[PDB]
Design a binder for these strands. Structure first.
Ligand code: SAM
Ligand code: SAM
Ligand code: CA
Ligand code: CA
Lengths: 336, 1012, 342
DNA sequence: TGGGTGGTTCTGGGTCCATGGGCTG
DNA sequence: CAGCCCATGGACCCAGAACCACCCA
DNA sequence: GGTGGGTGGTTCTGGGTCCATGGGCTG
DNA sequence: CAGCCCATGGACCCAGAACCACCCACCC
DNA sequence: GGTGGGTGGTTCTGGGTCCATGGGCTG
DNA sequence: CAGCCCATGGACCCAGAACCACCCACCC
């Protein structure tokens, strides 16, 4: 709030809003911009202190476009002041986390930041995005059951070169990190480099997933490699198989490259939201012209019902999956 | 308390949830627990936690805390809940279980309610320090209804005090008819002249009997220790004196008539039990008795109460300093304490409370000692310390350590032999090796007025020592180190056998007074560490200084400055620590500070005395104030001509001191004529009065007999009225009044005759503000006689000097001309105008402000010289003939008296000269002259020129308002000028001054931004 | 110290006097406030009724726990009623699972301090000097983390030779990138006029290996990453380090130096006092030069001053400022300079 | 519905002058 | 030598302004 | 010395609403 | 074409309710 | 069942060098 | 005037030994 008293911030903030009004959402507003900035400053502190990956931001394309906005105000005395005040919340977690080596134990903090930030800051935006985490047991089961049907109907495995797996909504990155732990080490390198792909829409989820994925790989292999297969894009808008994902230049490349990859397996937990709870909330589901038009022609046109609730976010992510699988494969989802 | 404690609560609540990581009641409740407890420990109660209480619902409801008294009585309660729950819906739940509802603070970490008498009195947010401070005030001040009845009854006794004293006085007049009374009364005045006052008068014994009766009745009525007056040494003596007369039907006659006055208070004090609540009646009687009996003797004794907060701070601090320095403690055996002035017995009552119950027996019996001069105090005190001891321990035991003696005279001798027991303990105290001397000594310098004839009792073997010590090293003319408090200090520096503490609350004069320069240099050789806490509050000041000083630590009852000082002498140099309370502060604030501040945690700047022994107000040495001199004592006391001439002038004159401004001055000479008639006529009658009455001043007080006059009438010689001596003169800025200027009606004429011989001599005087100068440095040049009340300590600097046989040789020094010609290659005439403008230089008057309020204003050589002499020329001429400068355009309008009644017209003709200001007190350029005449047309530059605390205009307006002659003989039996006859001349004078100001402002405004 | 213990005794007597109760619930507020105020001076704070899982799985709640800024317990307190047997009550509470690491079993009359599972000192609360000693020991008990940090600092000293091998190889692999050689040549020529006329590329590789080593431990052990970002000189040397130390180069060096930084970081994160962590700064200082440039350590002088000497020298300069210049070290105008800070 | 009425407590804001000590004399 | 100049701060009180009932015009 | 309230914290556990909003009429 | 009818299933949360822990009061 | 001995670790404790390198001489 | 004499005190460190912990052979 004190940053909007500086003309430099207001300038960068205004450029960002315009860029993300064509990359993320047509109605990106100052509220969404300040949420993204608060998320950057919060994740920055915790990623250097409890996860010991300060470099993440200096190698992350998105992080470098958002540090441009934060560098206007967050520096010197301003940063030293907010830091001395926030240390009373970060202190205890940092102390205990430094005596923990397994990232599989420290990934419980990542899940907590994800589910609690939205609940405390924007409860409304949490409903439209579907900020919830898939219990590990379910994730593990589907990864194993997908391998079973891949061998039954396609005579292939998830580790076999050619099976490109896409998670349309990464969240905390649970599906991709549990695939890393399933895939054999001798084959993991190739899969992590060109066969495991994922998409996110929110910044906190994106950062939490990229770190989770990169650190799970590091623990298993012994070396740190950057995951260049994560895109901050609306999965239901990137149907340009376009300015979607143009937050940064690398993000746009990753989006255009992903829309050409031959995907065999679309695993994931799609967001679910049929309608807003009360009209006073003014938090209706976004309109996705193309997907909605294809749902109308397929699902809705074949339904003999007076009320259609097939414009639920889960139904929109199922139509997309059917269309994304251009030839053969499995769409493994957990939903209503 | 208040903000200080509530702000610490706010910080400690944050640090509980920060360091602990829990916001549950059981953890966070320890922040309000400490707020309430520490507040109570200063209010004399204690918040004891988790105390069970059988309710009417048959449940031992245990609230979180119970505010309790020294008699184990629950006064208030406290239930804390967590921020999570809703305070309002949990108050209903606890109150439905039978929780108390008479005084309960239900509190969450963010909200706090107070259910007083069953109804929410206030709901505040705990985030706001001021709001919570006010809530807790009501909680700790709520008293049950019985207590409130007693309070109102104590207030009513103060109203009836003069009336019951009248009945008692009638009875003592009838005692004179009987010769048995006058028999033992004459024996008593003889035995009292050998122990208490060497000048014991019959009237003194009369008051001492009225005291035995009044207090004897109230020791059986209000309190119930009648046996005190039957077991007390002093009481038994004056009981015989009373018995001789007061007895039989005389006793009954007084008792029946006065039964009405002593009845209401008894009815209420029967309900009250706690001595701490009843002792407050004694404090009221202590002061109000002397108010309605001997007010002049009350001044001589300093009959005042020391607020408990000041006494509890000093007792607590002395313990810390006894450990830090002598590795001992107040409750250690061998650390005996003496009180030079017990008064209402507070410094020793609170010592009893501080001392542990285990060590209380020994200390009471032989290690706590005190002294008292008057009888009512002696009794009020002994009753208090006996009842306090009995309440704390549980057993009554008479105090055998109070001795009725003048502690200053008791230094061999029968001083203290009023009764045998008294002298037994007078010499016992002088044998006891006492280590700590705590108290509040009487402060009295000089006397009120010579007419009041209440001088200070001269003390031999005490003024003898102050002369050898403080006065010796003192270089000041009027050494006022003869104040009763400085005498008490010297007595104590001696009483202290080897090592110890002299913790007293006294006048702050010692810290920064010219007269007390010697004390500041002598005391550092008498003590090893000095800790001074200036509580300010000097109300004998005016202007911004007044607001800065703030309220007095003695509930705004006194007008002097106060300082709690602790003088410790060890078994290097002396460490003078100092801490002044914040400025612009009220009494309540200063008292709440003392109640909670712990001596250990007080920021104490270490002051280092300069060469002039000025502990405070240390002058800068970088500043080059070393430039010439206006006047120096050596220039005036000179016989070398130009040899020792090192200044600009050679005559230091001080404005005429009249000593009776009312009889020497007037608005018109016609009134002065009859004023001086009555005065000298009455003196000429007084010299015929018998030598005896003349010597004992048993005369009339109509005239203001001053020191010299009394001694002139003592030679029984005579005076004369001379209308030549009377001449016009300035006693106030821009106000000329006719003055007698007679040697007979002017006590100190100083060297003024040598400037304007009987006013005839023509001269121009650059009047100066003498040192020290509380009011901002003022300077003006006139041609009529000045008085010491014009500028602060007006020090006139003349142009010429009329010698013995009438020769006006220029006063201006030749050395100046010989030192100025070298610098700038002039004329003594213009050099006079020159220095006036150097004193008129803003940067000089501001950069050297500190230096100027220490010595005569040393004048810097000013580059231009010519321009400064021209500046000063117009300035000087403008302030000399201010009466005839220029009528500044002044919009004059008169108003009607509305309803045309004689009263309305006459009323609107009174002196209603009020400066019309606006918003934040900013003059709107209008000035109501009277109800009708309303002046206007005043620029803001007119109000800018200030010749002191007031503006040049406010000074005029003030002396044009009507006053009531403080002198009773002039108030009604003489003249009383009006304003309806002066209004026209005032309009004219105002107009002149308005232009005078804007011209001064103009000149001053063209001055450099830098000084030399 | 003594003052606080004297106030404790003044409160205990006035609670049973103004309140007329000997129940523990009311007489414990005296010791609660003694401990609370002593703690506030020692940088700790006494939180009351904080629950703690015991080994056998029983939630035990002592009457108060001493907590540090990192919300970690560094001491405990359990008050009982005087109408009991302390030794008997200590045994029962201990058997319920009460911690014995640092606990004051308080009774209105006497108090025992069980440190490390063993009675260390039993005093009488009626003594202002004995309780002051017992409390000094309770509020200065070295927790397990402090001892395990000092062990780690000693081991880092022995592993510094090996850690500097990884960093040396890095600065050598940077001499192949022309970007680095270009920046290094600029630095040597601006340091040949500022620091030493004979500044060599060997001296510049030392300042780089120092900037890198300290720019990792400052952000991990000391949690002051901003220092390097804002320090004037650090910004000049990051301009020479950012020509190579980034991306996969940094990731490789970081994964090979983590085995030498892991232990100190674990222990340091549980320490809140900078006075304890400053022993690591003293060890990095001395041991770096002993392992990298043992000759330059002789030229510059790389021995720290025992704190006892520095504190005496500061106290004595104050006594002598007063005796000769009638001033104090705190007075305005006394400018102090340390020519060789170390 | 002010307003008179008639007290009735808060509250800010400031004086001339006592009178001892050097001091020529 | 003893009358004659210098000083120096001084144990509140008091107009006057809300304000408070208090009916009551 | 148990023993039952008193008080506060610390785990389970059970159990369940009006109303958004597109599509189909419709006149 | 806008202005009526007609559906149709919905990404939690929270008040008791034990049940402990501790300890004052109450018997025993 | 200690006891001494084999093996490896962990504190203390005692006890001390040739030779740089500026300056004065000096023929 | 450049060789040629004349001092003069120096920012540690590492082998004996003690002793300790543990287990194996060795008495007991
Ligand atoms: C259930 S969470 C993802 C859960 C994930 N399987 C996990 O285990 O954390 C749904 C996520 O979908 C993301 N998301 C990605 N693309 C989206 C889109 N086009 N519309 C809505 N949400 C989208 C949201 O940001 C949200 O974090
Ligand atoms: C201000 S009261 C003492 C204050 C008292 N201690 C209090 O706490 O209120 C001053 C008292 O000192 C007494 N006093 C005792 N000895 C005295 C003496 N030698 N000269 C003057 N007053 C003296 C007076 O009688 C007077 O009652
Ligand atoms: Ca409570
Ligand atoms: Ca307990």
């Amino acid at each position: 709030d004190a940053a909007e008293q500086k003309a430099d911030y207001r300038g960068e903030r205004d450029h960002f809003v315009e860029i993300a009004k064509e990359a993320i959402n047509p109605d990106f507003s100052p509220r969404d911009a300040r949420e993204m900035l608060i998320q950057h400053i919060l994740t920055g502190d915790l990623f250097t202190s409890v996860f010991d990956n300060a470099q993440y931001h200096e190698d992350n394309n998105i992080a470098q476009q958002l540090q441009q906005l934060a560098a206007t105000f967050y520096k010197g005395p301003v940063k030293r002041d907010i830091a001395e005040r926030t240390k009373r919340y970060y202190g205890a977690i940092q102390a205990a986390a430094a005596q923990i080596a397994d990232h599989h134990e420290k990934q419980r903090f990542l899940k907590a930041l994800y589910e609690n930030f939205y609940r405390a800051y924007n409860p409304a935006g949490a409903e439209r995005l579907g900020i919830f985490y898939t219990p590990g047991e379910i994730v593990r089961f589907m990864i194993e059951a997908t391998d079973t049907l891949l061998e039954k109907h396609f005579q292939k495995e998830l580790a076999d070169k050619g099976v490109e797996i896409l998670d349309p909504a990464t969240g905390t990155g649970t599906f991709i990190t549990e695939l890393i732990d399933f895939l054999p080490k001798a084959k993991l390198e190739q899969k992590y480099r060109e066969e495991l792909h994922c998409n996110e829409l929110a910044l906190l989820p994106y950062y939490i997933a990229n770190l989770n994925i990169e650190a799970t790989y590091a623990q298993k292999m012994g070396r740190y490699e950057e995951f260049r297969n994560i895109v901050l894009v609306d999965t239901l808008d990137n149907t340009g198989f376009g300015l979607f994902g143009s937050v940064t230049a690398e993000n746009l490349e990753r989006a255009k490259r992903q829309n050409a990859r031959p995907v065999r397996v679309i695993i994931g937990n799609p967001p679910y939201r049929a309608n807003q709870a009360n009209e006073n909330d003014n938090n209706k589901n976004r309109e996705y012209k193309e997907i909605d038009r294809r749902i109308k022609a397929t699902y809705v046109a074949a339904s003999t019902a007076q009320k259609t609730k097939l414009y639920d976010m889960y139904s929109r992510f199922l139509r997309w999956a059917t269309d994304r699988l251009k030839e053969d494969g499995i769409v493994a989802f957990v939903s209503n | 308390m208040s903000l200080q404690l509530v702000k610490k609560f706010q910080k400690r609540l944050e640090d509980i949830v920060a360091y602990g990581g829990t916001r549950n009641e059981s953890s966070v409740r320890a922040a309000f627990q400490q707020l309430l407890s520490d507040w109570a420990e200063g209010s004399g109660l204690r918040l004891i936690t988790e105390v069970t209480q059988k309710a009417v619902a048959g449940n031992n409801v245990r609230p979180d805390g119970t505010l309790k008294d020294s008699l184990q009585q629950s006064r208030g309660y406290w239930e804390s809940k967590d921020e999570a729950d809703t305070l309002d819906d949990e108050i209903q739940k606890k109150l439905a279980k039978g929780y108390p509802r008479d005084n309960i603070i239900f509190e969450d970490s963010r909200l706090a309610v107070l259910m007083q008498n069953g109804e929410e009195v206030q709901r505040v947010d705990m985030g706001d320090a001021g709001a919570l401070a006010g809530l807790l005030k009501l909680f700790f001040e709520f008293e049950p209804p019985q207590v409130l009845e007693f309070r109102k009854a104590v207030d009513h006794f103060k109203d009836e005090m003069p009336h019951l004293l009248k009945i008692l006085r009638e009875a003592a007049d009838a005692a004179e008819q009987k010769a048995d009374y006058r028999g033992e009364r004459d024996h008593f005045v003889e035995i009292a002249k050998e122990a208490i006052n060497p000048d014991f008068s019959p009237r003194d014994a009369r008051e001492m009997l009225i005291q035995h009766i009044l207090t004897g009745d109230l020791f059986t009525s209000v309190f119930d220790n009648a046996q005190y007056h039957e077991d007390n040494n002093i009481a038994q003596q004056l009981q015989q004196l009373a018995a001789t007369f007061y007895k039989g039907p005389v006793k009954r006659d007084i008792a029946e008539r006065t039964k009405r006055y002593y009845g209401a208070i008894q009815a209420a004090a029967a309900q009250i039990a706690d001595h701490h609540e009843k002792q407050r009646f004694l404090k009221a009687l202590y002061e109000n008795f002397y108010r309605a009996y001997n007010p002049a003797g009350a001044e001589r004794l300093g009959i005042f109460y020391t607020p408990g907060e000041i006494v509890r701070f000093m007792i607590e601090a002395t313990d810390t300093l006894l450990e830090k320095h002598f590795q001992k403690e107040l409750a250690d055996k061998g650390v005996e304490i003496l009180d030079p002035a017990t008064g209402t017995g507070t410094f020793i009552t609170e010592l009893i409370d501080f001392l542990p119950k285990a060590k209380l027996e020994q200390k009471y019996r032989e290690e706590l000692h005190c002294n008292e001069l008057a009888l009512l105090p002696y009794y009020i005190a002994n009753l208090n310390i006996e009842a306090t001891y009995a309440q704390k321990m549980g057993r009554y035991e008479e105090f055998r350590n109070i001795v009725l003696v003048d502690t200053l005279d008791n230094t061999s001798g029968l001083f203290g032999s009023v009764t045998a027991e008294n002298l037994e303990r007078a010499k016992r105290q002088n044998a006891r090796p006492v280590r700590v001397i705590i108290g509040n000594p009487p402060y009295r310098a000089n006397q009120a007025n010579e007419n009041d004839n209440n001088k200070n009792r001269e003390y031999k073997e005490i003024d003898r020592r102050i002369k050898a010590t403080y006065v010796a090293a003192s270089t000041a003319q009027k050494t006022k180190l003869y104040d009763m408090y400085s005498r008490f200090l010297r007595w104590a520096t001696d009483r202290l056998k080897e090592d110890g503490i002299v913790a007293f609350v006294s006048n702050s004069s010692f810290i920064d007074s010219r007269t007390f320069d010697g004390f500041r240099k002598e005391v550092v050789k008498d003590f090893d560490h000095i800790y001074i806490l200036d509580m300010k509050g000097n109300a004998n000041t005016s202007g911004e200084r007044r607001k800065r000083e703030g309220g007095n630590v003695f509930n705004d009852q006194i007008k002097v400055g106060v300082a709690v000082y602790f003088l410790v002498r060890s078994a290097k140099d002396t460490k003078i620590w100092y801490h002044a309370v914040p400025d612009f502060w009220r009494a309540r604030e200063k008292l709440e500070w003392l109640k909670t501040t712990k001596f250990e945690d007080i920021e104490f700047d270490h002051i280092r005395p300069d060469a002039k022994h000025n502990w405070l107000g240390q002058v800068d040495e970088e500043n080059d104030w070393n430039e010439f001199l206006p006047v120096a004592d050596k220039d005036t006391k000179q016989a070398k001509g130009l040899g020792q001439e090192r200044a600009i002038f050679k005559l230091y004159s001080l404005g005429v001191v009249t000593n009776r401004d009312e009889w020497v001055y007037s608005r018109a000479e016609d009134e002065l004529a009859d004023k001086v008639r009555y005065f000298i006529g009455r003196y000429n009658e007084i010299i015929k009065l018998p030598l005896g009455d003349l010597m004992s001043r048993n005369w009339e007080g109509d005239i203001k007999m001053t020191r010299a006059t009394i001694a002139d009438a003592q030679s029984r010689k005579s005076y004369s009225l001379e209308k030549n001596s009377i001449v016009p003169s300035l006693y106030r800025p821009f106000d000329v009044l006719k003055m007698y200027f007679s040697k007979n009606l002017n006590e100190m004429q100083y060297q003024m005759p040598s400037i304007f011989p009987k006013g005839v001599g023509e001269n121009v005087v650059i009047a100066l503000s003498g040192s020290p100068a509380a009011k901002p440095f003022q300077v003006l040049a006139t041609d009529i006689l000045p008085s010491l009340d014009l500028l602060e300590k007006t020090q006139c600097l003349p142009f010429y000097r009329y010698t013995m046989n009438g020769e006006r040789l220029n006063n201006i020094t030749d050395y100046a001309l010989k030192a100025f010609q070298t610098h700038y290659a002039i004329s003594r005439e213009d050099i006079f105008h020159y220095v006036y403008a150097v004193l008129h230089h803003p940067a000089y008057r501001e950069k050297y402000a500190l230096n100027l309020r220490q010595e005569f204003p040393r004048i810097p050589f000013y580059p231009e010289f010519g321009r400064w002499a021209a500046w000063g020329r117009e300035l000087m001429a403008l302030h000399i003939g201010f009466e005839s400068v220029a009528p500044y355009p002044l919009k004059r309008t008169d108003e009607p008296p509305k309803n045309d009644t004689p009263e309305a017209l006459a009323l609107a003709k009174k002196a209603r000269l009020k400066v019309q200001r606006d918003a934040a007190k900013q003059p709107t350029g209008a000035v109501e002259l009277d109800g009708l005449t309303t002046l206007a047309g005043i620029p803001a530059a007119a109000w800018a020129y200030k010749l002191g605390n007031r503006s040049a205009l406010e000074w005029v307006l003030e002396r044009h308002k009507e006053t009531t002659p403080k002198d009773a003989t002039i108030r009604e039996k003489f003249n009383t000028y009006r304003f309806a006859d002066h209004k026209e001349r005032v309009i004219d004078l105002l107009a002149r001054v308005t232009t005078v100001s804007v011209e001064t402002v103009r000149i001053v405004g063209e001055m450099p931004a830098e000084t030399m």
